[PDB]
């Protein structure tokens, strides 16, 4: 059963919004504080840069997207273990 | 912006569980009571059968999976408009 593979103590909200030029913060909580996660934008892996800042605080895994523009208006997902959850970012 | 495409008033819960031989009920709520939805099991469209019963009550879109077995332990998603949400079903 997929039950033995549960990895998310807290998943992403269904959707988030942000004003143009603003910053959005995505947060998920893992059961295992040592488990690694990967973030994706519309299916392509996101990596640390000036647009994307990643933080790891114990069980929390955070992704900040800076200077949000319409190019950032998209679906995003994060993987942990054999699971994944997604969200939609709406840029105003 | 994807904001003008929002179609889910209520999305699926992150995960559901069910006992072997039991029945599970998935429910989502659309903003538009006339909008059609499609359900998928691990990426393949689910159709009305004895295993799958679909109900439409105003804005609510429901899917019942009967006689759940380990074969039903899987990821599922539903689409509405240009959006989709997913969930995991754990069979005990």
From Swiss-Prot, chains A, B:
Signal peptide: none annotated. Residues 6-92 form the Ig-like C2-type domain. Interacts with USP25 (isoform USP25m only); the interaction prevents proteasomal degradation of MYBPC1. Thick filament-associated protein located in the crossbridge region of vertebrate striated muscle a bands. Slow skeletal protein that binds to both myosin and actin. In vitro, binds to native thin filaments and modifies the activity of actin-activated myosin ATPase. May modulate muscle contraction or may play a more structural role. Belongs to the immunoglobulin superfamily. MyBP family. It is linked to Arthrogryposis, distal, 1B: A form of distal arthrogryposis, a disease characterized by congenital joint contractures that mainly involve two or more distal parts of the limbs, in the absence of a primary neurological or muscle disease. Distal arthrogryposis type 1 is characterized largely by camptodactyly and clubfoot. Hypoplasia and/or absence of some interphalangeal creases is common. The shoulders and hips are less frequently affected. This is Myosin-binding protein C, slow-type. The chain holds residues 252 to 338 of 1141 of the full protein.
């Amino acid at each position: 059963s997929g039950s033995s593979g549960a990895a998310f103590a807290k998943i992403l909200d269904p959707a988030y919004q942000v004003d143009k030029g603003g910053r959005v913060r995505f947060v998920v909580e893992l059961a295992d504080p040592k488990l690694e996660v990967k973030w994706y934008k519309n299916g392509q892996e996101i990596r640390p840069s000036t647009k994307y800042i990643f933080e790891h605080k114990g069980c929390q895994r955070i992704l900040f997207i800076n200077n949000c523009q319409m190019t950032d208006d998209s679906e995003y997902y994060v993987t942990a273990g054999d699971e994944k959850c997604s969200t939609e970012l709406f840029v105003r």
